Design a protein around this ligand. Structure first.
Ligand code: LQ3
Ligand code: LQ3
Ligand code: ZN
Ligand code: ZN
Ligand code: ZN
Length: 459
């Protein structure tokens, strides 16, 4: 029970306005045949065009919302909408394109999917709120068959070309006209009451409904993300490495140790309240400070209310010492805080569009994160970049240009000239820092934080 059986029943009530007279009793096997895709043999790796909710969640990077509206059924133009915001009009003879035949429309579909997905996934999962025309339009741009590899590399094939009779992955599909072996899921099969807009609007105020196909496609994918990552959370599902995941996570740990260590040295807080992940470890194990942990899982719906995390009777006195919120997203941070907050607006291959302003950050695990809100940081200031080190000035062991920087807080810089070891460490730290910031992380600190207080730790 890993794939969706083609003999599973498909509820057809959502299809009967576009397809009147559709049988109530219907399987995926009969639906696939009705879509024009009947095959005589089982294809290994491709037993069904449709997939389970569990398989869809494992392949969230491949999700592309897709809707087809009857612009005016082989006789009328169709408006094809995608969650990328694209609307294509196909004639049978927020981007909006004018009516063109299927032979040219299909080339655009392949280019758009290939550019959106080449750095995200080995496939496409069309997320539908199926009413009929989207399923019956697939035969015009989709070909199916045995699982194949790219003609130019080892990746699985996602596109086919009728011009050359060859197959390609998303990276090598330039000029290709057919989407090959796509996957799809119909959100209507999950058991909803009422239409798409009414279910979507219960959880999201960011996506509107201009009544165009891309608006519906965006809403469909958003509702699917809400169901699978907002109200339901599975942190046991692992996702493949597609970018700088390892360097980013390594940078996060280095920056956290640096910032916390410096805050403790600079302001000598007697207690640190570490609020967040129940699996957290002391990031500065050698520090004198009374380290107290408070469990809070990463909030995937709305940011935590500080009143619920702190009040309702623990050290109790969160006002004493300093509070550390490392990716623990609250509505309004207290003035005595050290904070790392993911900015959901960031554009990257790890950060997928989410629900109600939030984003789905996928790095080893999937984390739906509530919308970035600048008002959460009103009691704090942006943490400036700095590098601090009390380690001995000793090279041990890469060419060298002398470092001159006011933010290299070391004994050698206090002494007048940055040593080679501290220059190498500073440059490595700066690279890690910039990697973390560019990934979408933002750092904030209590207003009294001043790196001038670190110089006297060298006496
Ligand atoms: O008759 C068919 C055709 C396709 C299919 O699943 C997958 F290959 F698309 C299952 N049965
Ligand atoms: O503990 C974590 C790790 C990552 C995360 O995502 C972040 F971008 F919002 C949230 N909490
Ligand atoms: Zn390839
Ligand atoms: Zn939405
Ligand atoms: Zn040095």
């Amino acid at each position: 029970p890993t794939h969706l059986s083609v003999d599973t029943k498909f509820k057809t009530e959502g299809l009967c306005v576009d397809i009147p007279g559709i049988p109530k009793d219907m399987t995926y096997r009969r639906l696939i045949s009705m879509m024009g895709f009947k095959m005589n043999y089982q294809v290994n790796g491709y037993p069904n065009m449709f997939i389970t909710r569990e398989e869809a969640i494992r392949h969230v990077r491949a999700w592309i919302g897709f809707d087809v509206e009857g612009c005016h059924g082989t006789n009328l133009p169709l408006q094809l909408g995608f969650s990328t915001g694209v609307n294509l009009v196909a004639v049978p003879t927020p981007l909006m394109y004018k009516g063109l035949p299927w032979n040219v429309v299909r080339i655009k579909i392949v280019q758009m999917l290939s550019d959106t997905l080449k750095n995200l996934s080995d496939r496409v999962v069309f997320v539908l709120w199926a009413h009929g025309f989207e399923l019956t339009s697939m035969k015009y741009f989709v070909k199916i068959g045995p699982e194949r590899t790219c003609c130019l590399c080892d990746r699985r094939a996602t596109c086919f070309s009728t011009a050359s009779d060859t197959y390609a992955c998303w990276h090598h599909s330039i000029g290709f006209d057919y989407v090959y072996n796509p996957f799809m899921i119909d959100v209507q099969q999950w058991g909803f009451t009422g239409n798409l807009q009414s279910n979507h609007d219960l959880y999201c105020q960011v996506h509107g409904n201009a009544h165009v196909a891309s608006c519906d496609a965006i809403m469909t994918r958003c509702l699917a993300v809400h169901e699978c990552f907002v109200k339901r959370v599975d942190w046991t599902i692992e996702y493949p490495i597609i970018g700088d995941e390892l360097k980013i996570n390594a940078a996060c740990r280095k920056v956290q140790h640096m910032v916390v260590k410096a805050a403790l040295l600079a302001d000598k807080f007697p207690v640190l309240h570490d609020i967040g992940n129940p699996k957290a470890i002391k990031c500065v194990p050698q520090a004198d400070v009374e380290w107290k942990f408070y469990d809070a899982q990463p909030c995937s719906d709305k940011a935590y209310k500080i009143e619920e995390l702190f009040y309702s009777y623990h050290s109790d006195k969160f006002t004493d010492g300093v509070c550390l919120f490392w990716n623990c997203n609250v509505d309004r941070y207290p003035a005595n805080s050290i904070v790392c907050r993911f900015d959901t607006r960031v554009l990257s291959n790890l950060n997928l569009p989410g629900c109600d302003g939030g984003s789905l950050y996928v790095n080893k695990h999937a984390f739906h994160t509530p919308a970035f809100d600048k008002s959460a940081f009103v009691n704090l200031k942006q943490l400036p970049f700095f590098y601090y080190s009390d380690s001995p000035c000793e090279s041990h062991g890469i060419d060298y240009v002398p470092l001159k920087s006011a933010t290299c807080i070391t004994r050698c810089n206090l002494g007048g000239a940055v040593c080679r070891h501290h220059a190498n460490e500073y440059r490595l730290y700066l690279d890690a820092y910039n990697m973390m910031i560019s990934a979408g992380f933002s750092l904030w600190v209590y207003k009294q934080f001043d790196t001038y207080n670190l110089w006297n730790t060298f006496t």
